């Protein structure tokens, strides 16, 4: 996934608060998340891909092998089972917890990196540009 | 309540979607409500006060006597018991339904009419100016 490597900064967000609402994130956390304009850092070392999100309030980091299910603790503190695959040039992530699931797709669009999150019909789109 | 009589147009909104979230309003309805910039019309005839809200998508109207509980069907279709009193120069409304309650205060602030809605700690503020 060479096309994803680098540091990216958030440029725009659409329906993010609504997505967090469906996921079950609390008011305060949603408020903190909404003011945060995180920087996404993606790097690859061998068959391990690392995705790091940095914000003044909270940094998250996941390292994984494409196709292998792993444990992830989300920024809003959910302990989920995640699996990320490379499909059609996009990184497709599915998170499962308590009988529920959500999909997060990271894809290239022109010179931007677009992240789409889907939870029960509600879709959020966040656009990033290289920092 | 002579100070409230007239037609008012929405000028600004703060945390309205979050308030609707706490009240239990669905995604689609919240989306329609968020694009609506309603006009509030207040009039008094004898001891009956009428508050009418007009929008391209939905008009609501309630007529009541201050201090007497009455039935109200909200824009989001909840059938509630409402009671409105005049306290400290402000119209204070309490809506009760299914063991829950929310308070809506309509007050004058300078030349504006301010509406504050509170639901479980979440507070929304909407400012109106004369049309
Ligand atoms: C108290 C600190 C709060 C920090 C933010 C917390 C956010 C909690 C909700 C996270 C939902 C999942 C986000 C997936 C990546 C979206 S994207 O950002 O990668 O595009
Ligand atoms: C499909 C049509 C949708 C129309 C809008 C529906 C809104 C539903 C939620 C209403 C919550 C209560 C609003 C109190 C007055 C707020 S204020 O507006 O008077 O300031």
Swiss-Prot record, chains A, B:
Q: Which Pfam families match?
A: Lipocalin
Keywords of the record:
Acetylation, Cytoplasm, Lipid-binding, Nucleus, Phosphoprotein, Transport
According to the record, mutating residue 31 to A results in: Abolishes ligand-induced translocation to the nucleus
Which residues in this protein are found as Phosphotyrosine?
19
One BP annotation, GO: brown fat cell differentiation
In the UniProt record, does the keyword Nucleotide-binding occur?
Answer: no
Question: GO CC terms for this protein?
Answer: cytoplasm; nucleoplasm; nucleus
UniProt short sequence motif Nuclear localization signal, positions renumbered to this chain: 21-31
An example Gene Ontology molecular-function term: hormone receptor binding
In which compartments does the protein localize? Cytoplasm; Nucleus
InterPro entries, A to Z: Calycin, Fatty_acid-bd, ILBP, Lipocln_cytosolic_FA-bd_dom
| Positions where N-acetylcysteine occurs in the chain | 1
The entry assigns this protein to a family as follows: Belongs to the calycin superfamily. Fatty-acid binding protein (FABP) family.
Read off the PANTHER family from this record. FATTY ACID BINDING PROTEIN (PTHR11955)
Q: What's the record's remark on domains?
A: Forms a beta-barrel structure that accommodates the hydrophobic ligand in its interior.
Self-association and partners: Monomer. Homodimer. Interacts with PPARG.
Functionally, this protein is described as follows:
Lipid transport protein in adipocytes. Binds both long chain fatty acids and retinoic acid. Delivers long-chain fatty acids and retinoic acid to their cognate receptors in the nucleus.
The identity of this protein, by name, is Fatty acid-binding protein, adipocyte
Q: Which organism is it from?
A: Mus musculus (Mouse)
């Amino acid at each position: 996934c060479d096309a994803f490597v680098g540091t990216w900064k958030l440029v725009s967000s659409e329906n993010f608060d609504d997505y967090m609402k469906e996921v079950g994130v609390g008011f305060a956390t949603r408020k903190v998340a909404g003011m945060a304009k995180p920087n996404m850092i993606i790097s690859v070392n061998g068959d391990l891909v690392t995705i790091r999100s940095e914000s003044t309030f909270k940094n998250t980091e996941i390292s994984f092998k494409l196709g292998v299910e792993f444990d992830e603790i989300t920024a809003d503190d959910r302990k989920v089972k995640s699996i990320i695959t490379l499909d059609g040039g996009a990184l497709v992530q599915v998170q499962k917890w308590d009988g529920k699931s959500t999909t997060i797709k990271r894809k290239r669009d022109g010179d931007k990196l677009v992240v789409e999150c889907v939870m029960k019909g509600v879709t959020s789109t966040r656009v990033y540009e290289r920092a």
